[model samples]
Target: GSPEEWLDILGNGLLRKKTLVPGPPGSSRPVKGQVVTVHLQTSLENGTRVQEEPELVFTLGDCDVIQALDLSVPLMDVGETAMVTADSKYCYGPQGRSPYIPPHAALCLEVTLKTAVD
Candidate 1:
């Protein structure tokens, strides 16, 4: 079956393509007014790592990552890195990002700020 249909069945509403790519940062850097490029990893409480880089440009306040990402990146500085967690309550709840994060599962991330962009 096409991934499009498959995702729809999974109930993500088939909104965005599944790249499994995660790029964004959690820093004490300046990000309130800028977009950023990042390479990231989403982990579970178990310490398993999922490379989600090259995923896409994460737009602040956008549906790019999640609330954790939205809140974490701005806490970092250019070139700073952080390990942020997306509580199941803050991540995809009942419907997770299949294969990426499981349903009702909390996720963790190593957010690396690559650069600041306009």
Candidate 2:
């Protein structure tokens, strides 16, 4: 019940969602089949930055991204960022992301929803 409370968005208890910036009212959300642009960083719980970018553009459901990344966007607003936590199952699966991420490893992502292309 705190300000930084985490919620069970997927209901499997593997992924967690926390709002950092709530964004402004009336900001649009990404819908199915639309394109989303986000600044994302995929890292472990230790706060290391493994992957990052100024912006990344991809289709909502048609893109080949991690399930957790996909799920993290709609929860945000344009110009808003959040911390999304995902267990291995929702990430790269049991295979992990190889050298950077190991199997059954949980991932910590700081993602900002930059824009959505309707």
Candidate 3:
């Protein structure tokens, strides 16, 4: 299958997801106002590691993190691990995170949804 076949996270194709390990069957996906915990590793498209978090917690739609994360996390199932490709617009944008992400650079994120609490 071509790269285009990956599950498009958003309709515009700028954000996409591919599962690395599926979560357990019958697990519930996160919903708005819920607090989710995840293990996240972020890197540039060229494979340079930027940030890593063993357990990052944030409320869905709270914007505590990047736009890509808030939008994509809800679509993930607890215990699921996946790779997310996000464009700059959904990331740090033109002025990327200083000293880490470059301007207008796309990012590749390895995300694991550890838990979600209502």
Q: Give each model's whole-structure lDDT.
A: 0.59, 0.79, 0.86
Lowest summed lDDT over 10 consecutive residues: which window, candidate 3?
A: 1-10
For candidate 2, list the clashing residue pairs, or say none.
Answer: none
Clashes of each: 11, 0, 0
lDDT of 3 by residue, 1-118 (tens): 1224467877999998877777888876888888999999999988899999998998988999998889888877788887889999999999898898889988898899998888
**Cα TM-score per model:** 0.67, 0.88, 0.92
- Total backbone collisions, model 3: 0
Question: For residues 38-77, could you state the per-residue lDDT of candidate 2 as single tens digits?
Answer: 8888888787776786678889877468888887677777
Best-to-worst lDDT order: 3, 2, 1
Measured by C-alpha RMSD in angstroms, how accurate is candidate 1? 13.0
lDDT of 1 by residue, 1-118 (tens): 1212212212343211221223333433555557777767777878877557744466666666776666666655666555665557666788987686788877766766777776
Quick one: how many clashes does candidate 2 have?
Answer: 0
Off by over 4 Å in 2: 1-3
lDDT of 3 at 14: 94
Give residue 45's error in model 3 in angstroms. 0.9
The alpha-carbon RMSD values of the candidates against the true structure, listed in the order shown, are 13.0, 2.0, 2.5
